[PDB]
C-alpha cells in the first residue's frame, strides 16, 4: 500500500507542478527512504530538500517519477523507491519495481510479452495483410 499521510520533501513550490489533468485523470506518486537530509533536483525544476526517512512526491507523468528514481539511484545511491499510479476515485496501482526486482535484472516468474520467434527480416509484405486486421509485425 502507498500511505497518503507520508511526509514530503521541503520545497518552496513552482509553476512546473501538476495541473487539472492530475486531479481528474491520473497522477503518479514516488516514495523513498533517505538516510540523511539532502538537496536534489526536482524534475519539474528547482532544488528541494529530501527529509531523512520517508519521502512522498506526486507528479503528473510516470516519466517524471522514473526520472527522479534514476537521479536517486545515480546521485544518492537510493534504490528503495516505489512508484504508484493514483486515480481520482482513490484507487492505487503499484507500478515499479513491478515484482520487487528492477526490470534490468532477470527474474524467474516473468513471462515474455511481445516477443516473436523470427528475425526482423522475416516479416511478411504489407500486401499480404491487405483487407485484414493483421499487421506485418504481428
Q: Minimum distance between the CB of residue 116 and other proteins, rounded to whole angstroms? A: 5
Contact residues toward other proteins (CB under 8 A) are 12-16, 18-21, 25, 39-41, 43-49, 60-64, 66-67, 70, 83, 95-96, 98, 103-108, 110-121, 123, 125-128, 130, 135-137
Q: Minimum distance between the CB of residue 123 and other proteins, rounded to whole angstroms? A: 6
Q: Minimum distance between the CB of residue 75 and other proteins, rounded to whole angstroms? A: 10
User: Which H or E element spans position 102?
Assistant: none
Beta strands in 60-102 (DSSP E): 82-86, 92-96
CB nearer to other proteins: pick between 5 and 19: 19
CB nearer to other proteins: pick between 41 and 54: 41
Side-chain half-sphere exposure of 80, counting CA atoms within 13 A = 10
Amino acid at each position: 500500500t502507498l500511505n497518503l499521510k507520508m511526509p514530503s520533501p521541503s520545497f518552496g513550490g513552482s509553476t512546473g507542478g501538476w495541473l487539472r489533468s492530475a486531479e481528474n485523470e491520473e497522477k503518479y506518486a514516488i516514495t523513498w527512504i533517505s538516510k540523511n537530509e539532502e538537496v536534489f533536483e526536482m524534475p519539474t525544476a528547482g532544488a528541494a530538500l529530501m527529509r531523512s526517512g520517508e519521502n512522498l512526491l506526486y507528479f503528473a507523468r510516470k516519466e517524471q517519477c522514473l526520472s527522479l528514481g534514476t537521479q536517486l539511484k545515480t546521485q544518492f545511491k537510493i534504490d528503495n523507491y516505489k512508484i504508484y499510479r493514483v486515480f481520482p476515485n482513490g484507487e492505487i496501482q503499484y507500478l515499479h519495481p513491478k515484482d520487487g526486482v528492477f526490470p534490468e535484472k532477470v527474474n524467474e516468474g516473468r513471462k515474455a510479452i511481445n516477443t516473436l520467434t523470427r528475425s526482423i527480416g522475416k516479416n511478411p509484405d504489407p500486401v499480404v495483410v491487405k483487407f485484414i486486421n493483421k499487421q506485418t509485425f504481428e
